[PDB]
Structures are given as structure tokens and as C-alpha cells.
Design an enzyme around this catalytic site. Structure first.
Site, short mmCIF file in Angstrom:
data_model
loop_
_atom_site.label_atom_id
_atom_site.label_comp_id
_atom_site.label_asym_id
_atom_site.label_seq_id
_atom_site.Cartn_x
_atom_site.Cartn_y
_atom_site.Cartn_z
N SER B 1 0.83 -1.18 0.00
CA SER B 1 0.00 0.00 0.00
C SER B 1 0.88 1.25 0.00
O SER B 1 1.96 1.26 0.61
CB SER B 1 -0.79 -0.11 1.32
OG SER B 1 -0.26 -1.19 2.19
N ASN B 2 0.35 2.33 -0.58
CA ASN B 2 0.99 3.64 -0.45
C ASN B 2 -0.02 4.61 0.13
O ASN B 2 -1.23 4.48 -0.12
CB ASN B 2 1.41 4.22 -1.81
CG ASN B 2 2.25 3.31 -2.60
OD1 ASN B 2 3.25 2.81 -2.13
ND2 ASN B 2 1.91 3.20 -3.91
N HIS B 23 -2.73 -1.60 -1.68
CA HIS B 23 -2.45 -2.71 -2.61
C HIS B 23 -2.96 -3.99 -1.97
O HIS B 23 -2.36 -4.50 -1.02
CB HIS B 23 -0.93 -2.84 -2.90
CG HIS B 23 -0.31 -1.57 -3.40
ND1 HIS B 23 0.97 -1.18 -3.03
CD2 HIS B 23 -0.79 -0.60 -4.22
CE1 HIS B 23 1.24 -0.02 -3.62
NE2 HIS B 23 0.20 0.34 -4.35
N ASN B 269 4.81 1.09 3.43
CA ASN B 269 5.03 -0.18 4.17
C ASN B 269 6.42 -0.33 4.77
O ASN B 269 6.76 -1.40 5.23
CB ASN B 269 4.77 -1.42 3.31
CG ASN B 269 3.41 -1.37 2.62
OD1 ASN B 269 3.35 -1.46 1.39
ND2 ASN B 269 2.31 -1.19 3.40
N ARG B 297 9.58 1.98 -3.27
CA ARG B 297 8.38 2.82 -3.42
C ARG B 297 8.45 4.07 -2.54
O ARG B 297 8.07 5.16 -2.96
CB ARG B 297 7.10 2.06 -3.07
CG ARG B 297 6.66 1.09 -4.24
CD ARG B 297 5.37 0.31 -3.86
NE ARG B 297 5.60 -0.70 -2.81
CZ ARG B 297 4.97 -0.72 -1.63
NH1 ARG B 297 4.07 0.22 -1.29
NH2 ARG B 297 5.26 -1.70 -0.77
#
EC number: 3.5.1.97
Lengths: 163, 548
Positions: B1-2, B23, B269, B297
Site C-alpha cells: 500500500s501507499n 495494494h 510499508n 516505493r
């Protein structure tokens, strides 16, 4: 009783209005069944530990666990005493949301003729109870913990007389 | 996830803004579903939820938007048991031998003949929780076994917690509501409000050990491998109690990381540490947050966020829709130099040409250079000491970087790695000239839909995970519910998509409609006001009731 006003906008997004949590839950469970009854029914079979009963031991859950290990794990996780304790600890607002959801999902099932549901008539597609929603909740709860060790739990047995 | 929350000091409009990019799986019990919930006068919230939950899990309301990302905190501990040397079904605590409890469950199994048979199974449990076996790592032998205590098994507050989040007015109120109940099981929370506050909370349910117990109670070799393992033969290694915690044995809210800013906070994350590098979060329990190298990321996000220029909604949207493979920034420049140094090696010519042509993205039209790069990276990862600039803790945003081509050993191994990847790619049966969208798809009935994005481990912010299925890569998880929220004067403006569409049923009109939009990266309005809802020419209404 239970009552909800539902508006859907583009792409099938529901907008649910109600005067209280029971009616709000009624709208949510109906709208969600219209889109995803088969999915919820399958995941409830998983969280009840009944996959092997309906699908045999050669299949897997949607988490890619084998059916019998998955069933042992969820039968352990979602024992009656655990679900009762979890329910007894809920506020009236949350109990009402859950009661409404189950009733709204079941109302869609009673009325469905197949327009948007591919699994009508399957034995695993059935009316749901608030305990089933508690089963789903607990399954999600342990996803960062013992759920990642489900195969390992099922595998744990004491040694024999090996050297 | 972001997730990225921007406040009044960096947003173009001086108000808050939130990008939510979880995500999650495209199927199953964690498949997001969009809905808007209103009890007029006291509840009005919209976003997406998980199957079976009558609450919004990621969403927004009139003055607030919030989302979640999976955190790095431990939400369980393992306990290494010292078994009674006379009986491997007993274990010692303070030298005293205790019996395991045995709880049997009975399962019905449908056989080849169609009949049901009953299978019974014993689950052994200690005072900590059930025993677990990982053959070759966590065994159950005559000396030791391992039990697992899960902190969320007693978290009966989880539904209440999102019910309360759904009622929150602004970021201060959201923080009070989460710190008060501590019902969040295993995610960070990021949020922004109209007033321009940006919030990060690593406020979840985490086993608590007082600081002096942590080195005493740890199993050193297992903790070194990332497992939260404790000495289960010592009663002093029970989780610590603190009256301020909402649940016995979990970490009180004041000891968990929170950052409240007016510029930005982000998470992809990694731990709380570099949520915003201008104010590092340090000094927490290792069960909670550690200072580890951040992944590509987050390094990507911080490379776009740091600095002085105002951030627009479009800027955050394009961080997702660019599909930039940020790991290429660290390795592709030196890899291409190695290609130029070897123009005579026939085995490398096609990979070097593909890599040189490549737009460094995971777009539908991105060329086979992306596939060569992935397979190269899977081998690069196994090499030792190949980074030109290894991770530097004083430069966590910019390291590791580059290939150490000046070391003859590294040049040799990296060239071998590329030749290996090139052979692997060429041994696959992928059509010449196929582009990334020809390979990566999501099946709908017996149509496919091309899906942009790529694995988050290569630094693609639009993280998509797929698995080989016949002739293609079938998407199994990744970008899911997308929501970008701003707060103009008339009310919240939310934009996004549910990438896999509302319905999982092929019969539904809403089985693939947003997936076509996701393929084309065409986000849409998320209508929230009665005005926005009524302006929709597709509006359908139904009222339902029954007796209780």
C-alpha cells in the site's frame, strides 16, 4: 423495523441512507449481495471451516490454503465460545449494524432470480447469521498474526521416538 | 500500500489533500467494495470496505479523508518453549512442568464417492497460545517447541474502531478516536483534513514489553531473522501490563509513533522512521518501529515530495499513473554502460537493445525492456557487494545506488546475471514485439483486459502483482481502491477508481466497467454530496423495508 433508502450512481456505487444502524446495515447487506453474494457465501464457508464439506480435500480457499487445513484452522479460530465472547463485547450500535447486514443480504437472496448472481441453487449459498459476519471479522483480525501461521498450527504435533 | 497526506504548507490550495493507494487482493475476503453511508445528522462517510464489514474502512467525510497501509510492527510474538525432558507434551515455566491443553475440532470431508466422513484433529495449546511448526526452523522435538500469542485475538474493538473513525470530524478528532479505543489490528493510518493538517499514526495493536525486558526476553538468532520470538520458559517474559492500554498486554497509545505535520507524511510499508525525513521517528520498541533501509516505493515518493514546490492533486495522481519503475533509476544507468562495454557479445545484443529502448515504465505500451529488467533484477538481488554505493544510514534516501563495475568480480557476475536473464526471457515463449500490456492482464469472462503497473518491489508506485497463467500474467493483487481527496470550498472533491470493479460476478453490469477505466488510467469523480449524486444521469433508487 428495518428500512433503508439506496441510491446507486455510475459503476454501481451504493449510497445508503437510514435513520439508525439496523437500517443502515440492511441497506449495506442488500447492496453488497446484489454485487457479491457468491463471493461472500464462499468466504463464509471458509470462515465456518466447511470447505472440505462442500468442495472436498483437493481444493483450496481464495487464500490458497488447502481445504482441510484451512477448515481445521477456522474451526479452531471460530469456536462457539470465541464467537459468543466477541458478540457479548460488542456495543449495541455494532450489533445493530451486523443484524441489519445479515437481514439485508438475506432479503436479496430471497428475491434474486439470477440477474446478477451466478451461484443460485448451490448448497453453500444460504441465508447468513450475524455469527457468520463475526467469523469473517475474526478471520481478518488475525491476518497480521496467527493467520499467517495457519498451516504451521495445523502441522504442530509432538514427536514420536525418533533419533 | 501507499499513502500520502499533504497539509497547508505544501498543498497548492493551502488545504489538506490525501492520496490513498492500498495494494490488496483482486479476489476473495480482502476484495474492497465502494459504498457511501449516511445516517442524516450524525454519519456521512464514503469510501471502500472489506467483504462482510458494515463500515467504511478507507474513505472520506465532509472535512476529513483517511487511509491505511500495512505496518511493519509485530502483532504477535512466538514463545520458545522448554519441554519437560520426561514428556514432550509438557513444558517448563520457572522450572515448573505444565501440561499442554488439547482442543479437538471435527471437520466433515466430502469424499471421491460423494459421501461425508468425519475427521478429528487435535490442536495443542500452551498458556501463550497454540503451538506452531515450521519444519527445519520451528520444530517440535524433545527439547523445544514454539507457541504463538496473537495480540488481536482479544481485540474485540475492531468493528467499533472503524464505526468511530466513520464518525470523525477532522484529524484531531480521528487521532483522539483511534488513541482512545486502540482497535486497529495491523495498519498505519494516514489522514488529511480541510484545515490542512497531515497525520501519520502507527497506532495498532502491538504486544508490549517494557524496554528492559526486550533484550532479556528475545531469542537472538530468531529476532535477527525478523521473528518476534521470546523466551517462553521465563514468566517474566509475559507481555507487560500498563493501565493506560486499552487491552491487557498491548502497547499504550502514547508509546506508538505519531507525526502531525502541515507539510506532508507518507508511507509505503516501511517503518515509521522516515514518514517525513525532516522529523525522523526513532526510539521506539523494536516490536513497533525500527530504522531499516526504506524500499524503492517510499524512496520514489520522497524523491517527488521533498523540496519547496506546491503539490497539486494532479501531481499525486501522476505519481500513480506514471508507472515509473523507480528501481531502474538505481541500476539501469550502469547496466547500460556495461551493455556498451560488451557490444561484441552476441548473447547480450537483444537484451541491451530492449533495455536501451525502454521507457523505464510499466505502462501498457512499455517494451520488453521491462521484462528483461525484472529478470535481471531477480538475479542482481542475489549478488553480494554489487552496489557501487551501498546502503548508507546517513543517506537513507539515496542509497543503495549504482553498480560497482570497477570491481572486476562484480563486472563479471553482473554480466553473467544479464546473460542468464536474457536467456531466461528468450526461452519463454513471448511473441517478439509484445508490449507489457499484452502480457499482464485481468481476465473477465473469456475476455482479457490489459492492466498497467508492476511489482512494488521494483519501485513501481502503482504496484501490481501477477502470476503466470497459460500464455499471460494474470493480475492477482495490487492497486485496488484508489481515492484522491481535496477540500475545495463547496465540499470534498474525491477522485479515483475501484480497479477490479464493484462486482466479482460475471453476470453483473459492474463486473468490468471500472477495470476498462483502470486499463486506460481514467479516474473518475466519487460523488458525495446530494448535488453530485443527483447530477448522475445513471442514478437508480430503491427503498426497502421489512419487520425486525
Amino acid at each position: 423495523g428495518l428500512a433503508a433508502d439506496i441510491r446507486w450512481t455510475a459503476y454501481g456505487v451504493p449510497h445508503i441512507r437510514a435513520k439508525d444502524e439496523r437500517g443502515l446495515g440492511y441497506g449495506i447487506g442488500y447492496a453488497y449481495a446484489r454485487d457479491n453474494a457468491c463471493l461472500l457465501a464462499e468466504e463464509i464457508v471458509t470462515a465456518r471451516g466447511e470447505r472440505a464439506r462442500y468442495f472436498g480435500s483437493e481444493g483450496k480457499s481464495s487464500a490458497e490454503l488447502d481445504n482441510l487445513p484451512s477448515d481445521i484452522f477456522y474451526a479452531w479460530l471460530n469456536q462457539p465460545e470465541a464467537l459468543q465472547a466477541f458478540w457479548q463485547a460488542q456495543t449495541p450500535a455494532v450489533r445493530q449494524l451486523l443484524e441489519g447486514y445479515a437481514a439485508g443480504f438475506n432479503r436479496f437472496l430471497r428475491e434474486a432470480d439470477g440477474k446478477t448472481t451466478s451461484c443460485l441453487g448451490q448448497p453453500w449459498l444460504r441465508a447468513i447469521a450475524t455469527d457468520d459476519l463475526l467469523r469473517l471479522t475474526r478471520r481478518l483480525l488475525v491476518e497480521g498474526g496467527v493467520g499467517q501461521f495457519a498451516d504451521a498450527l495445523v502441522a504442530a504435533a509432538p514427536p514420536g521416538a525418533e533419533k | 500500500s501507499n499513502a500520502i497526506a499533504v497539509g497547508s504548507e505544501r498543498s497548492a490550495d493551502g488545504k489538506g489533500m490525501l492520496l490513498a493507494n492500498p495494494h490488496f487482493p483482486w479476489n476473495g475476503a480482502m476484495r474492497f467494495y465502494q459504498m457511501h453511508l449516511t445516517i442524516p445528522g450524525r454519519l456521512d462517510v464514503m469510501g471502500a470496505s472489506l467483504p462482510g464489514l458494515p463500515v467504511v474502512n478507507i474513505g472520506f467525510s465532509r472535512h476529513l479523508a483517511w487511509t491505511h497501509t500495512v505496518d511493519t510492527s509485530s502483532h504477535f510474538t512466538l514463545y520458545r518453549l522448554a519441554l519437560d525432558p520426561k514428556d514432550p507434551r509438557r513444558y517448563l515455566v520457572d522450572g515448573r512442568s505444565l501440561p499442554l491443553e488439547e482442543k479437538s475440532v471435527a471437520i466433515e470431508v466430502r469424499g471421491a464417492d460423494g459421501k461425508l466422513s468425519r475427521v478429528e484433529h487435535k490442536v495443542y495449546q500452551s498458556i501463550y497460545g497454540p503451538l506452531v511448526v515450521w519444519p527445519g526452523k520451528l520444530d517440535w522435538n524433545r527439547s523445544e517447541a514454539y507457541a504463538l500469542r496473537d495480540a488481536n485475538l482479544e481485540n474485540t474493538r475492531v468493528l467499533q474502531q472503524w464505526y468511530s473513525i466513520n464518525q470523525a470530524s477532522d484529524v484531531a478528532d480521528l487521532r483522539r478516536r483511534v488513541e482512545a479505543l486502540q482497535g486497529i489490528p495491523w495498519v498505519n493510518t494516514l489522514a488529511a483534513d480541510e484545515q490542512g493538517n497531515a497525520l501519520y499514526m502507527n497506532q495498532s495493536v502491538v504486544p508490549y514489553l517494557k524496554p528492559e525486558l526486550i533484550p532479556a526476553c528475545a531469542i537472538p538468532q530468531l529476532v535477527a531473522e525478523g521473528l518476534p520470538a521470546l523466551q517462553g520458559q521465563d514468566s517474566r517474559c509475559a507481555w507487560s501490563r500498563d493501565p493506560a492500554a486499552a487491552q491487557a498486554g498491548i502497547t499504550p497509545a502514547a508509546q506508538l509513533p505519531v507525526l502531525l505535520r502541515r507539510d506532508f507524511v507518507q508511507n509505503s510499508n516501511d517503518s515509521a522512521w522516515l514518514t517525513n525525513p525532516a522529523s525522523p521517528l526513532q526510539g521506539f520498541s523494536p516490536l513497533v518501529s525500527q530504522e531499516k533501509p526504506i524500499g524503492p516505493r517510499a524512496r520514489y515518493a520522497l524523491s517527488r515530495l521533498q523540496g519547496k514546490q506546491p503539490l497539486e492533486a494532479k501531481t499525486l495522481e501522476e505519481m500513480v499513473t506514471a508507472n515509473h519503475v523507480f528501481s531502474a533509476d538505481q541500476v539501469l544507468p550502469d547496466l547500460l554502460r556495461l551493455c556498451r562495454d560488451n557490444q561484441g557479445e552476441k548473447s547480450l545484443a537483444r537484451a541491451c537493445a530492449a533495455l536501451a529502448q525502454w521507457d523505464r515504465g510499466a505502462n501498457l505500451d512499455s517494451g520488453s525492456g521491462f521484462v528483461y529488467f525484472q529478470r535481471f533484477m531477480q538475479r542482481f538481488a542475489e549478488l553480494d557487494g554489487a552496489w557501487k554505493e551501498p546502503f548508507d544510514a546517513q543517506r537513507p534516501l539515496d542509497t543503495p545506488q549504482g553498480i560497482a563495475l570497477d570491481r572486476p568480480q562484480v563486472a563479471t557476475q553482473v554480466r553473467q546475471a544479464l546473460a542468464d536473464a536474457a536467456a531466461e526471457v528468450e526461452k519463454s515463449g513471448i511473441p517478439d514485439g509484445a508490449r507489457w500490456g499484452d502480457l499482464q492482464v485481468s481476465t473477465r469472462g473469456q475476455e482479457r483486459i490489459a492492466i498497467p503497473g508492476g511489482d512494488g518491489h521494483f519501485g513501481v508506485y502503482n504496484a501490481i502483482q501477477s502470476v503466470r497463467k497459460g500464455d499471460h500474467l494474470e493480475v492477482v493483487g495490487g492497486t485496488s481502491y484508489i481515492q484522491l481527496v481535496t477540500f475545495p470550498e463547496e465540499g470534498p472533491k474525491a477522485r479515483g477508481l475501484l480497479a477490479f470493479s464493484q462486482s466479482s460476478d460475471p453476470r453483473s453490469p459492474h463486473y468490468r466497467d471500472q477495470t476498462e477505466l483502470f486499463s486506460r488510467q481514467q479516474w473518475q469523480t466519487l460523488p458525495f454530496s446530494d448535488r453530485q449524486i443527483d447530477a448522475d444521469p445513471q442514478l437508480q433508487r430503491l427503498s426497502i423495508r421489512e419487520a425486525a
